[PDB]
Ligand binder design. Structure first.
Ligand SMILES: CC(=O)N[C@@H]1[C@@H](O)[C@H](O[C@@H]2O[C@H](CO)[C@@H](O[C@@H]3O[C@H](CO)[C@@H](O[C@@H]4O[C@H](CO)[C@@H](O)[C@H](O)[C@H]4NC(C)=O)[C@H](O)[C@H]3NC(C)=O)[C@H](O)[C@H]2NC(C)=O)[C@@H](CO)O[C@@H]1O
Ligand SMILES: CC(=O)N[C@@H]1[C@@H](O)[C@H](O[C@@H]2O[C@H](CO)[C@@H](O[C@@H]3O[C@H](CO)[C@@H](O[C@@H]4O[C@H](CO)[C@@H](O)[C@H](O)[C@H]4NC(C)=O)[C@H](O)[C@H]3NC(C)=O)[C@H](O)[C@H]2NC(C)=O)[C@@H](CO)O[C@@H]1O
Ligand SMILES: *[C@@H]1O[C@H](CO)[C@@H](O[C@@H]2O[C@H](CO)[C@@H](O)[C@H](O)[C@H]2NC(C)=O)[C@H](O)[C@H]1NC(C)=O
Ligand SMILES: *[C@@H]1O[C@H](CO)[C@@H](O[C@@H]2O[C@H](CO)[C@@H](O)[C@H](O)[C@H]2NC(C)=O)[C@H](O)[C@H]1NC(C)=O
Ligand SMILES: *[C@@H]1O[C@H](CO)[C@@H](O)[C@H](O)[C@H]1NC(C)=O
Ligand SMILES: *[C@@H]1O[C@H](CO)[C@@H](O)[C@H](O)[C@H]1NC(C)=O
Lengths: 189, 189
């Protein structure tokens, strides 16, 4: 990393390796390597990490697949709606659904100002015509499970998992917890 | 019906043939018969119906399958949560999910008083362990479609359709409207 110092750092609410790497001018993959993290997406609240700070040569690419900006304008299969929770923004919710912000705003012409939404407000999610998810049902959380990773494994999205578990905080999942998991969401015909 | 008079009546918000029959001391099936209604569950806002009033011999049974009080304590497959809309009560939401009121309250110990819920509040829906719906996706509304009837045809519940379309008023469905429809919800294994 060619860091100028190492700090031991305590992981707090809202942290990701991306946010940590940016705060300390480090690299995602250097933090992974130095701490022997099995999964760059998983860091536990209250854990200590060694962070190489102010790196001349940060690596943010080798260990992670950085997904591009969403380009789709609809979500396959479900849901028709999503309920706003504390901290949500239309930007982040569109990202979670892998759709453009523009498409989500367009689906919600009842919203007067897209930056003024309220906890408990229901928004429409634009669903692709002729689309479905194949088998939506119970799943028990195992150690290290994350919505981001389940979405990839099961061919869905973070947003779709959130909508089906809309009062579940993704950062507070417990081993054995039952969630509802959609699978294999796609256009058909 | 052995009515003592007939009134022409205009269907308004919240009406069902059950509520009309009770207001006018008529019978569901007599109103069906006299008005040549194809589907006892379907009466259109603003329609006129002939109602035989104050019947000595009301028929509320021959044309309808009156379902009993729910006895199940969980819903198969989905959803993890439901968002309260105007007019909702935990009694009616449990009925829509075909579960006991008791089970829904038990799933929601965060609610201090079950009679004081707010529009926009998110409640947990108790989902049966080891259960799924088979193919959740888009459906276009055709003339005369109702959530009550789609639930029966597709082996789901009114509540599950509502949760997947939580800002859709079931009384305001339009021909061609895309909704999200779960199917074949059951325990598995
Ligand atoms: C490389 C990069 O920046 N990737 C990000 C990616 O990290 C984002 O995903 C979010 O990551 C955070 C951090 O890992 C997730 O929060 C963690 O969630 C898990 C599960 O709830 C928590 O684990 C629990 O931890 C406690 C101890 O604290 C243990 O007792 C529990 O057993 C344990 N549970 C399990 C099942 O193992 C962990 O504490 C949380 N950490 C923090 C800092 O909150 C968050 O869930 C995750 N978000 C989603 C939606 O999956 C991702 C966000 O989109 O972007 C990148 O891909
Ligand atoms: C026997 C008995 O009491 N059964 C009840 C059952 O009626 C309950 O179900 C509710 O029924 C009401 C009344 O039929 C449903 O509301 C109607 O909904 C339809 C669809 O949205 C409306 O149709 C539209 O009408 C306008 C004109 O007004 C037309 O322009 C549209 O084309 C037309 N749309 C379609 C697709 O045809 C109709 O106006 C509504 N009527 C009223 C009075 O609101 C209501 O949706 C339905 N509820 C559900 C959840 O399905 C049922 C409730 O659980 O209990 C019994 O089984
Ligand atoms: C978000 O959507 C994009 C666009 O559909 C997805 O990227 C495409 O995935 C398909 C299916 O495997 C590939 O054929 C394309 O080549 C992918 N890239 C692009 C630029 O279109 C991407 O998978 C989705 N991201 C997430 C996180 O779900
Ligand atoms: C509500 O739940 C009850 C109980 O599961 C359902 O009634 C049963 O349906 C099964 C499956 O066909 C039958 O084998 C039972 O005989 C039924 N009756 C009883 C008393 O258990 C009923 O189908 C559900 N109602 C709705 C509207 O979904
Ligand atoms: C699914 O179909 C919709 C509707 O035509 C289209 O907009 C969308 O891009 C399709 N999705 C994919 C991944 O091809
Ligand atoms: C589904 O399984 C659950 C969990 O055991 C049980 O409570 C429920 O009654 C089952 N449903 C049916 C319809 O048999």
């Amino acid at each position: 990393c060619g860091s100028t110092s190492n700090i031991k750092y305590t992981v707090v609410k809202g942290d990701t390796l991306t946010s940590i790497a940016k705060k300390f001018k480090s690299g995602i993959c250097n933090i992974v390597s130095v701490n022997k993290l099995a999964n760059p997406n998983l860091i536990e609240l209250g854990a200590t990490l060694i962070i190489p700070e102010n790196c001349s040569n940060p690596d943010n690419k080798s260990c992670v697949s950085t997904p591009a900006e969403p380009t789709e304008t609809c979500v396959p299969g479900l849901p028709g709606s999503y309920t706003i929770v504390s901290g949500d923004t239309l930007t982040n919710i569109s990202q979670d659904f892998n759709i453009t912000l523009d498409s989500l705003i367009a689906a919600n012409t009842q919203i007067e100002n897209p930056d003024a939404i309220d906890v408990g407000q229901i928004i429409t999610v634009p669903v692709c015509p002729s689309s479905q998810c194949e088998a939506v049902g119970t799943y028990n959380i195992v150690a290290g499970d994350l919505f981001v990773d389940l979405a990839a494994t099961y061919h869905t999205t973070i947003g779709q998992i959130k909508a089906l578990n809309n009062n579940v905080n993704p950062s507070k999942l417990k081993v054995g917890q039952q969630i509802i998991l959609p699978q294999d969401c796609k256009n058909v015909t």
